[PDB]
Design a protein around this ligand. Structure first.
Ligand SMILES: *[C@@H]1O[C@H](CO)[C@@H](O[C@@H]2O[C@H](CO)[C@@H](O[C@@H]3O[C@H](CO)[C@@H](O)[C@H](O)[C@@H]3O)[C@H](O)[C@H]2NC(C)=O)[C@H](O)[C@H]1NC(C)=O
Ligand SMILES: *[C@@H]1O[C@H](CO)[C@@H](O[C@@H]2O[C@H](CO)[C@@H](O[C@@H]3O[C@H](CO)[C@@H](O)[C@H](O)[C@@H]3O)[C@H](O)[C@H]2NC(C)=O)[C@H](O)[C@H]1NC(C)=O
Ligand SMILES: *[C@@H]1O[C@H](CO)[C@@H](O[C@@H]2O[C@H](CO)[C@@H](O[C@@H]3O[C@H](CO)[C@@H](O)[C@H](O)[C@@H]3O)[C@H](O)[C@H]2NC(C)=O)[C@H](O)[C@H]1NC(C)=O
Ligand SMILES: Nc1ncnc2c1ncn2[C@@H]1O[C@H](COP(=O)(O)OP(=O)(O)OP(=O)(O)O)[C@@H](O)[C@H]1O
Ligand SMILES: Nc1ncnc2c1ncn2[C@@H]1O[C@H](COP(=O)(O)OP(=O)(O)OP(=O)(O)O)[C@@H](O)[C@H]1O
Ligand SMILES: Nc1ncnc2c1ncn2[C@@H]1O[C@H](COP(=O)(O)OP(=O)(O)OP(=O)(O)O)[C@@H](O)[C@H]1O
Ligand SMILES: *[C@@H]1O[C@H](CO)[C@@H](O[C@@H]2O[C@H](CO)[C@@H](O)[C@H](O)[C@H]2NC(C)=O)[C@H](O)[C@H]1NC(C)=O
Ligand SMILES: *[C@@H]1O[C@H](CO)[C@@H](O[C@@H]2O[C@H](CO)[C@@H](O)[C@H](O)[C@H]2NC(C)=O)[C@H](O)[C@H]1NC(C)=O
Ligand SMILES: *[C@@H]1O[C@H](CO)[C@@H](O[C@@H]2O[C@H](CO)[C@@H](O)[C@H](O)[C@H]2NC(C)=O)[C@H](O)[C@H]1NC(C)=O
Ligand SMILES: *[C@@H]1O[C@H](CO)[C@@H](O[C@@H]2O[C@H](CO)[C@@H](O)[C@H](O)[C@H]2NC(C)=O)[C@H](O)[C@H]1NC(C)=O
Ligand SMILES: *[C@@H]1O[C@H](CO)[C@@H](O[C@@H]2O[C@H](CO)[C@@H](O)[C@H](O)[C@H]2NC(C)=O)[C@H](O)[C@H]1NC(C)=O
Ligand SMILES: *[C@@H]1O[C@H](CO)[C@@H](O[C@@H]2O[C@H](CO)[C@@H](O)[C@H](O)[C@H]2NC(C)=O)[C@H](O)[C@H]1NC(C)=O
Ligand SMILES: *[C@@H]1O[C@H](CO)[C@@H](O)[C@H](O)[C@H]1NC(C)=O
Ligand SMILES: *[C@@H]1O[C@H](CO)[C@@H](O)[C@H](O)[C@H]1NC(C)=O
Ligand SMILES: *[C@@H]1O[C@H](CO)[C@@H](O)[C@H](O)[C@H]1NC(C)=O
Ligand SMILES: *[C@@H]1O[C@H](CO)[C@@H](O)[C@H](O)[C@H]1NC(C)=O
Ligand SMILES: *[C@@H]1O[C@H](CO)[C@@H](O)[C@H](O)[C@H]1NC(C)=O
Ligand SMILES: *[C@@H]1O[C@H](CO)[C@@H](O)[C@H](O)[C@H]1NC(C)=O
Ligand SMILES: *[C@@H]1O[C@H](CO)[C@@H](O)[C@H](O)[C@H]1NC(C)=O
Ligand SMILES: *[C@@H]1O[C@H](CO)[C@@H](O)[C@H](O)[C@H]1NC(C)=O
Ligand SMILES: *[C@@H]1O[C@H](CO)[C@@H](O)[C@H](O)[C@H]1NC(C)=O
Ligand SMILES: [Mg+2]
Ligand SMILES: [Mg+2]
Ligand SMILES: [Mg+2]
Lengths: 331, 331, 331
């Protein structure tokens, strides 16, 4: 029976290690560079803003990032803001009846300005505390619904991924060598029809993750594009191909709805004829697209092979002899 | 005694491996997304700049980043810069007595413009070489002390961290489900009183790292916020909690004081009525806050358990039999 | 012979493990922070743009990044763009003979505006479809050659790298303590003469990677600066030194030339006296410099040493006894 036992061990070393686990290969991780470009135009003709055009230079903030990009889907605008004194937005906290309620220097965390201790009139019927800030102050109580830039559902995104394995002298990109300019000009990614077109539609990205673009566009969120490289360098180089998957990354609270979506504030600065600073305040809601790249390569190397061989041999002998010892003890 | 030896080995496999090392669990790394928001307003009434307001759109450059943010604490401003010809800032190098000293095209690395080979008068008493640049040139010899935006010590920062373990289908955020909006509106992190409030005060961040905010605010630096997730997925999901620690990341030289702090330059561009380009040059000193997230999860899996079991068995037999061989040789 | 065999095993444990592999050391990975600064000025006197000055605030977009930076080398400018109606750039697709060819709402992915269904005259001889966009539309058919900002070859880049090993309480930077301000003011990196000056010239960076800066500057690309830390903490702290290498990261297609270089679009916004929005559209070509830091440290620890010792002992006995068993079977 010893011979039988030793054989099973031989099976383990040959089938599970060298074949199943490819113990004959050396492994390495990937170094990746990602660049993105978005195309699409949105047109709005609201009464307050008039006729507006939104192109790539308008809704992508900033122009370029690393492994990420942000696309604006909803917006609140405050134009003609100047440094001075103004009343606050009326609420349960800022409403005052006299100067006694207001305290000078009450610069809280949520106050967009520094209170001057004076109770001034926001309009004819309400009176609020006066602050020193950019005036008039922003009113963000009514987020637009549906999204202001809901046409972003039909925008397209090109992902250019350059991967490099420093150990094996192997580099390539996700734009395959058999892709032409004519094909790249009019291709949209699909898992079945165009699995290697590197151009994705944003609405399709959100839908493939199991969500709805129009629901997510009102307040924003985080979407994760996962690129996977599983290349065996013993094969041809044309068989090292990427795989794409999508997942929503921001966790949503439905019991309390604490801190939903994703937004930030930025401004565009101007000057008048007199030289005074002026600005437009922009509260931007939108979706951030993170590109996550995983990849490992394998190439045949003699060292790992030999190491495993020795281990298997040792293992076999030890086991067989262990079995022999146990058999005599049982006898 | 063989029985005794085999027993000790049994102890090793049961106590150190399965229990202490949790060999019965499969492990995975974390995928994290970090978003930040800063609140706070600073007011200055200097003579040169007049009355100014600094809000989040003014001192955070750029509006949003990935795993990082920059807050301005000190500033030098050069307003009304136009492209043309101007003298350099007087020093030991730019001061000239005649056009012979100046050489045309002497565009060095530290020259903010290209020298035209002419010696012009900086003012009535000093004469410096003429350059072609944005004029007038910046004078950064006197860094303001104390910091211009020293009120940034009292600003607050919200950190939103979304973590995902791809292997186990587990995702959550650092804003716990038992945190409400009322609590989040007025909470400040403290290791003892509020260990899970995700809002930190910048001065407290710098102080908890063993430093002083006012000293660091004059020239800037790098501060590292470390988030640690140590979650055992066999337990309840509410026990996967983050831990926060802080450390200053920029190494300071005190023997020579070579390249201290952290600063960069950026500009705001304007136009006049005639269409000529005009700009304000801004040299910004401040602190960069890097968010570093570490996390590993563990969940029970049968494979690792069995593997360890086999190893322990093998080990035991081999050892016991090794001891038996050694005993006979000693005899 | 048993004694001989056991001896060879002793050699393995002593020479390959403890000495060659340093099994007596505990290992750790690095946490790195990278900051960059670029110096250099370019002057152009083209007929369309007039006299222009390009300083660090003009060609670095954005002002600061994380582990990366972008330097502009070529540019196409479209000034005085306003929202309205204008014809498209003539080509094989936009040229129309009547309003029947144009379809209203034909907002494609490659259309910079939304077609209004009208065929208007681009100039006296050609007629193209009308779109609603920022007008006039950009004409990017003729990329300037040689590069507009080809003087960027002589710009210099300072890399400040702060590394930290959390396990061993060891931190330092790539600006060595024996580097002075006088040396840092006028040093350029060279592998033989100045191997530790942290200031690199961009043209030299591209040349050391095996390429030409002027060829790469017309359309741009990605360049990778690799920093390597190989520190043995048992030695003196002054011997933990960085090593620099360079590699081009963007893969180029020469058979089809699909998606070459690297570029993006951004705008500068202005207002007129009447309050209408106006902008300058900028298509920027340039090189992105990615800083990649690898580092592992080793310090003596008793645990790893003991573990290896035990393994070696076990190994020796098992092997020697395995050989003894095999010998009797052969007999
Ligand atoms: C360029 O080379 C790539 C190879 O990386 C070609 O990809 C191939 O694309 C076709 C069409 O999408 C795939 O066929 C598919 O087969 C599945 C069944 O396996 C079927 O369900 C689909 O409907 C489709 O017929 C093919 O699998 C894929 N090759 C792979 C994945 O290795 C691509 O077509 C080439 N393009 C050109 C223009 O030559
Ligand atoms: C929401 O759930 C968290 C659980 O993750 C609650 O955290 C708990 O907070 C309290 C109060 O800060 C901690 O009590 C502390 O105990 C230490 C001694 O261990 C003491 O020195 C402190 O002064 C304080 O009393 C408690 O340990 C902590 N739970 C943990 C760490 O598991 C939080 O209170 C909950 N919030 C609400 C509003 O229910
Ligand atoms: C500051 O300390 C560093 C040590 O990290 C000094 O680096 C040393 O620089 C010199 C000059 O570049 C190197 O000498 C070189 O030797 C090779 C042969 O090994 C030769 O081919 C070169 O032409 C050059 O002579 C030296 O190896 C290097 N030390 C190392 C690498 O450990 C640096 O010089 C110090 N600076 C000052 C101002 O003291
Ligand atoms: N840096 C900060 N300091 C203190 N509170 C903050 C900070 N950032 C956000 N908050 C508060 O946390 C809550 C949820 O944050 P969130 O930004 O998602 O909501 P929000 O309505 O967009 O916040 P806000 O409009 O006040 O900027 C808000 O009530 C907000 O006031
Ligand atoms: N890209 C660069 N090329 C050459 N020298 C540089 C570069 N960046 C910085 N330096 C020099 O390195 C030294 C230290 O850098 P650091 O930026 O910290 O000081 P600094 O006074 O803020 O620099 P500067 O004001 O000239 O921009 C300075 O003397 C600076 O001139
Ligand atoms: N987001 C996108 N959606 C669709 N097509 C795209 C997108 N980004 C780029 N492309 C197309 O891919 C091709 C190669 O991209 P690339 O940007 O390198 O060339 P380009 O001439 O600079 O592109 P363009 O000038 O149209 O912005 C171009 O024909 C471009 O139109
Ligand atoms: C995105 O594009 C699709 C297709 O171009 C739009 O879907 C069509 O929209 C038109 C009106 O523009 C409707 O008449 C059609 O019934 C829609 N469906 C189809 C199948 O054609 C879609 O509305 C666009 N999304 C936007 C603009 O947000
Ligand atoms: C890693 O791969 C690159 C790409 O093949 C090699 O670059 C070649 O380098 C030689 C000598 O420097 C040149 O003659 C070739 O023209 C280069 N090829 C290309 C495509 O540019 C590089 O040498 C490889 N590295 C090593 C260590 O062999
Ligand atoms: C940050 O805020 C604290 C508390 O609001 C300030 O500390 C107080 O400042 C006032 C003046 O504004 C003094 O009268 C008090 O004596 C200070 N201490 C206390 C305990 O109240 C602090 O000055 C602020 N830091 C700034 C503005 O840089
Ligand atoms: C990973 O976890 C998510 C979250 O639980 C799973 O998403 C569910 O998917 C099913 C089918 O697609 C839906 O019916 C549920 O509504 C989803 N849940 C939520 C909360 O959105 C996802 O299926 C899991 N992945 C796998 C492979 O099981
Ligand atoms: C980068 O700088 C070098 C040296 O400063 C320039 O090379 C010289 O340029 C001058 C003209 O400015 C020529 O007369 C010399 O013959 C060039 N060579 C040498 C060795 O001096 C180089 O032209 C610059 N590159 C630019 C401006 O793109
Ligand atoms: C890690 O290293 C730092 C730097 O040496 C240590 O910081 C010292 O901390 C003590 C007590 O907090 C201070 O008295 C020293 O002045 C600090 N040194 C410096 C240079 O700032 C830190 O304590 C170390 N960490 C541990 C756990 O020992
Ligand atoms: C925008 O809407 C107004 C109101 O109907 C209309 O008068 C105007 O012509 C529209 N804009 C354009 C560019 O047609
Ligand atoms: C003043 O403003 C508040 C808040 O928007 C509003 O409720 C109130 O009706 C306004 N009063 C008048 C007279 O417009
Ligand atoms: C800047 O200077 C020009 C003249 O050089 C002047 O016309 C303009 O008003 C100035 N701008 C400001 C903001 O003072
Ligand atoms: C700023 O200081 C000046 C000088 O004291 C003062 O006249 C002015 O009123 C101050 N600004 C404001 C908004 O009060
Ligand atoms: C000219 O400027 C230099 C440098 O700031 C200064 O030292 C000198 O006193 C100035 N001369 C006059 C007359 O203002
Ligand atoms: C841009 O054109 C408008 C008229 O369309 C003109 O008033 C303005 O002066 C121009 N701007 C520049 C910078 O030439
Ligand atoms: C730019 O070139 C023109 C044309 O030769 C010249 O008149 C002008 O003086 C040049 N610019 C400068 C600043 O000299
Ligand atoms: C009109 O523009 C097209 C495209 O640039 C050009 O080919 C053509 O010669 C132009 N016609 C006239 C009359 O300028
Ligand atoms: C903003 O308001 C000022 C007066 O406060 C006015 O002079 C200016 O024209 C306004 N700007 C716009 C764009 O309406
Ligand atoms: Mg709000
Ligand atoms: Mg300086
Ligand atoms: Mg084009």
């Amino acid at each position: 029976m010893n011979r039988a036992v030793q054989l099973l061990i031989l099976a383990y070393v040959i089938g599970w290690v060298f074949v199943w686990e490819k113990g004959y290969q050396e492994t390495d991780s990937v170094v990746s560079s990602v660049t993105t470009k978005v195309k699409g135009v949105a047109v709005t003709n609201t009464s307050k803003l008039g006729f507006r055009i939104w192109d790539v230079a308008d809704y992508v903030i900033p122009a370029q990032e690393e492994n990420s990009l942000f696309v604006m889907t909803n917006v609140i605008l405050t134009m003609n803001q100047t440094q001075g004194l103004c009343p606050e937005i009326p609420d349960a906290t800022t409403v005052c009846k006299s100067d006694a309620s207001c305290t000078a220097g009450s610069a809280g965390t949520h106050s967009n300005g520094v209170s001057t201790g004076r109770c001034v009139a926001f309009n004819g019927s309400v009176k609020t505390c006066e602050v020193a800030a950019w005036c008039p102050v922003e009113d963000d109580t009514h987020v637009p619904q549906p999204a202001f830039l809901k046409a972003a559902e039909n925008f397209t995104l090109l992902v250019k991924n350059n991967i490099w394995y420093p150990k094996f002298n192997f580099s390539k990109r996700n734009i395959l060598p058999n892709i032409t300019t004519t094909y790249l000009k009019s291709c949209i990614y699909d898992a079945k029809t165009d699995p290697f077109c590197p151009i994705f539609r944003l609405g399709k990205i959100v839908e493939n993750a199991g969500h709805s673009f129009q629901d997510m566009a009102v307040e924003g969120g985080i979407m994760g594009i996962q690129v996977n490289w599983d290349c065996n360098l013993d094969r041809a180089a044309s068989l090292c191909l990427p795989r794409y998957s999508f997942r929503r990354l921001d966790t949503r609270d439905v019991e309390h709805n604490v801190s939903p979506g994703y937004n930030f504030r930025f401004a565009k600065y101007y000057r008048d004829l007199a030289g005074n600073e002026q600005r437009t305040l922009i509260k931007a809601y939108g979706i951030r697209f993170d590109i996550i790249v995983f990849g490992k390569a394998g190439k045949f190397d003699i060292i790992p092979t030999m190491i495993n061989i020795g281990s298997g041999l040792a293992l076999l002998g030890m086991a067989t002899v262990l079995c022999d010892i146990i058999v005599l003890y049982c006898m």
